Design brief:
homodimer, 419 residues, 2 domains, 17 helices, elongated, binds uridine-diphosphate-N-acetylglucosamine, binds a molecule of 2 linked components (NAG-NAG), binds 2-acetamido-2-deoxy-beta-D-glucopyranose, binds calcium ion, N-acetylglucosamine-1-phosphotransferase subunits alpha/beta (chain A), EF_Hand_1_Ca_BS (chain A)
Amino acid sequence: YHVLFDSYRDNIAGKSFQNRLCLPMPIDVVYTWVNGTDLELLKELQQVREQMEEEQKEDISASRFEDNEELRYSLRSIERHAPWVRNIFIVTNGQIPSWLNLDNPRVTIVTHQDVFRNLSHLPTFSSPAIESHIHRIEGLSQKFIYLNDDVMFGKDVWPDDFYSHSKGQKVYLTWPVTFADSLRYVNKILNSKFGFTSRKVPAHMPHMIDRIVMQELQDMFPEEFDKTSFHKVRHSEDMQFAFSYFYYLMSAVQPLNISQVFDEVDTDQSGVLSDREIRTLATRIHELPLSLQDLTGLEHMLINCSKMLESYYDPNLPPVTKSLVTNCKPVTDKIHKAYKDKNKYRFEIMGEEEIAFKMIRTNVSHVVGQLDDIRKNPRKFVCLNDNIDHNHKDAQTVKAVLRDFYESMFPIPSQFELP
Amino acid sequence: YHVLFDSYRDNIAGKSFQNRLCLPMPIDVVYTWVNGTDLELLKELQQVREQMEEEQKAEDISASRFEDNEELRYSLRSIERHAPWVRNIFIVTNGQIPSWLNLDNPRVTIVTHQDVFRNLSHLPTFSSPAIESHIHRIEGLSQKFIYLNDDVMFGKDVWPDDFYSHSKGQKVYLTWPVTFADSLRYVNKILNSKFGFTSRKVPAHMPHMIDRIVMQELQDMFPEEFDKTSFHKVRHSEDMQFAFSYFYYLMSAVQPLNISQVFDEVDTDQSGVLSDREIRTLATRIHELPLSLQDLTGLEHMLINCSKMLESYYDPNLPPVTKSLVTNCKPVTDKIHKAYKDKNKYRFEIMGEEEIAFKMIRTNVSHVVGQLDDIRKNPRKFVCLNDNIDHNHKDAQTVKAVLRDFYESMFPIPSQFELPREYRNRFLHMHELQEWRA
Ligand SMILES: CC(=O)N[C@H]1[C@@H](OP(=O)(O)OP(=O)(O)OC[C@H]2O[C@@H](n3ccc(=O)[nH]c3=O)[C@H](O)[C@@H]2O)O[C@H](CO)[C@@H](O)[C@@H]1O
Ligand SMILES: CC(=O)N[C@H]1[C@@H](OP(=O)(O)OP(=O)(O)OC[C@H]2O[C@@H](n3ccc(=O)[nH]c3=O)[C@H](O)[C@@H]2O)O[C@H](CO)[C@@H](O)[C@@H]1O
Ligand SMILES: *[C@@H]1O[C@H](CO)[C@@H](O[C@@H]2O[C@H](CO)[C@@H](O)[C@H](O)[C@H]2NC(C)=O)[C@H](O)[C@H]1NC(C)=O
Ligand SMILES: *[C@@H]1O[C@H](CO)[C@@H](O)[C@H](O)[C@H]1NC(C)=O
Ligand SMILES: *[C@@H]1O[C@H](CO)[C@@H](O)[C@H](O)[C@H]1NC(C)=O
Ligand SMILES: *[C@@H]1O[C@H](CO)[C@@H](O)[C@H](O)[C@H]1NC(C)=O
Ligand SMILES: *[C@@H]1O[C@H](CO)[C@@H](O)[C@H](O)[C@H]1NC(C)=O
Ligand SMILES: *[C@@H]1O[C@H](CO)[C@@H](O)[C@H](O)[C@H]1NC(C)=O
Ligand SMILES: *[C@@H]1O[C@H](CO)[C@@H](O)[C@H](O)[C@H]1NC(C)=O
Ligand SMILES: [Ca+2]
Ligand SMILES: [Ca+2]
Ligand SMILES: [Mg+2]
Ligand SMILES: [Mg+2]
Ligand SMILES: [Mg+2]
Ligand SMILES: [Mg+2]
């Protein structure tokens, strides 16, 4: 209300910090949904025949394209635990769920036609290739949550669970470093670019993605992401969606700005460094404990720069202006050496305590046990990956168990369902 | 206006979640400040003379407990620079008024011990814990407020995210396991008696965010010893520490188990009757994994028996499992109590001491200079310079000068709460000002 709006300027500064107190909104959810239809196996079988026909002179296991009713219950989980989401985007080959309520303005189907920039990759059948273009959806919010169609919210989620203005995005990591091969390939690329370091793969969970950061990452590696889009099957040489994005967010650096250093040392907004400001600059430049020798050396460097181009204790010291510091080679050299490289983005490394990731390894008793483990300990993010044979007789029993578990957690039909 | 208001209703639910997204507002700052005036020194000598005659029948008074090292001025400057979101500032001054304070500013207010203590029988307080025991009683104070110690200040840049988050509650900054140490041990024994034995760590010397409701509940839970620490006229060995008690009440307040809530969180159908899937969820919650068929069968047998005493299930004789049937079923409720461990009433988030700068100013120039340089090299969110100066050594003046120079390097620009250097408050006490008005 008007009283609520004026309350933001009711502080000592007489200014509104609503953009700094209210979390980044609006936020959208993007899904990648694939189904094995009558016209999808036919196009799938065209590619598989030409894969092994040339190289001599497993990825495609039907668990990559099978519906276990996971999208419907993921949408129900969003409606139940994340009611703050604005719009839902479902990215498909043109397949539309038989139960999806297209008349609902909040949910839209986005075909690969509108997503891929170069349409010579339309028969995709590859999650990394589709995900590399997931940030190009028209009308997408700058902050959006990418859902993997197996992941869903289990307990309750708020934008604070992904992003904080103070510490930036939350990065949930797991065990260190086709999926493993792609992880190692991206790890080598990041070692070449940002330097050698140890990395840990992000958890299987809804990922918050910034469109600007993702676009900058893809501009930094145009050829790698073009190759990722080119492939029609998950390959060892494609950029993993979450690993590359999060370890670019955590590794991107910003060039040091001497003007910013001067402004943050010159605390009185005068443009000239006083004795105290020179002292704090010397402290930030040299290595503690500070001695009179270091301060005298800094004074000598400033005096020499002045000769070769308020009141002070040293009578020979000129007024230390921003120009005198920026145009001084040794002082700027010391600034560049002492100041460690700063990250362009803020991030907060988290743990996997609130993430329930489980693989459905076609065993009815074990599947029931792990679903019961989810039931007893409700976690914030739940992932149920498909490792079923889909030809075994137990496959239908496993699907029934999963459907019963889903119905137990989310029985109420969502607004995205045809009545 | 309306465009901004309609933004929060633009979601799948169609509701506004602004209260869950936009942090707790407003937030106020409370200061406790004391000056070594002649009038205060006269009352100080009365207590110490009576203090000596008490111990003869069978330091908490030293000047470092009361001396003004100009820390309040630079703390207000730090608030104006790094925490511009604060609404109002309250200073509890023992009736005094800082000479440089600009009382004409409507965002700074002097509150005296008269309006703070419950009864006026121990007004000559001279004890920080006693004054802190009534901080939450300030009229017009916001529900969540940050208590400033007049020598702690904001160092880098702070936001309400550094104190509170809706998802994870208040942030608790703990440093190391447990007169100040004696008070910590006393409160630790009290908490061991009340909430049970555990390992505890003292909160950091920093701006502490306090909720008025939580503090009032804590003081209602321990009325006798809070009144005891209230009526002490000197910092005492056995008194309730302000931050330790509040934070380990926030982290230890448990809430009694509610069977209706458990049923509602298991009955996801919102129908009032547990289905077979919901009964399996309840069995998983109660029993220890793996959930054998024997355990579920036993649960079903217990439900059937207790139904006999007073949507098609697998058991044809199993009645509809209603909420009333579960609440009136003694064995399943006992097993729920034995399985569901006690949940905390308040949500909190334990933090580290990485962004906290706490140092002891132990009247050595070569060491104070090094410590302040360490602050200069590595800015931190919260900086505390705790007074430990000898105050009779010749180096006290030089140490004060070094501290003032460090403060001026950090915050040179005068704040909005200061009078111009050519002006000064006419009266240094509230009662004199009231006499001047009337
Ligand atoms: C939560 C998480 O970290 N998920 C990652 C995981 O997925 P995972 O290994 O679980 O890959 P899935 O088989 O679940 O496929 C991932 C997603 O791609 C979709 N899909 C798949 C094939 C297809 O032709 N069309 C289509 O849209 C699925 O519907 C699903 O939404 O490893 C993949 C390969 O590194 C990544 O791409 C995924 O982001
Ligand atoms: C940041 C922090 O955790 N500080 C705690 C620390 O303070 P510490 O041991 O540093 O206590 P100080 O000497 O700084 O005094 C604390 C506060 O009380 C004020 N004061 C003191 C004496 C007096 O007669 N009037 C008056 O108003 C001071 O101005 C200051 O605001 O240990 C005390 C022991 O109980 C606690 O109470 C303080 O909360
Ligand atoms: C996913 O693909 C399957 C397989 O094509 C679809 O199931 C078909 O649905 C149509 C329309 O109702 C029926 O006429 C066919 O008999 C079904 N085929 C099979 C093999 O079951 C299904 O509708 C697609 N969509 C979803 C959301 O699962
Ligand atoms: C699209 O990709 C194909 C891959 O063969 C390439 O030949 C073509 O040039 C690309 N199109 C554009 C417009 O870059
Ligand atoms: C299925 O899991 C159970 C334990 O739940 C195990 O004993 C059994 O051997 C598994 N069956 C197969 C075929 O691997
Ligand atoms: C503290 O009290 C002394 C005692 O005379 C007085 O001179 C001084 O102005 C007071 N200080 C402040 C900061 O108000
Ligand atoms: C002041 O405090 C208590 C209540 O907190 C009151 O009953 C008591 O009489 C007063 N103290 C003394 C010493 O009379
Ligand atoms: C349990 O929670 C419900 C929520 O509606 C509340 O009405 C009820 O009083 C609670 N039961 C108790 C406190 O015994
Ligand atoms: C102050 O510390 C220095 C070393 O930092 C030491 O040499 C000196 O003796 C100390 N002075 C006192 C009075 O303790
Ligand atoms: Ca200056
Ligand atoms: Ca039910
Ligand atoms: Mg799948
Ligand atoms: Mg998956
Ligand atoms: Mg003090
Ligand atoms: Mg102190």
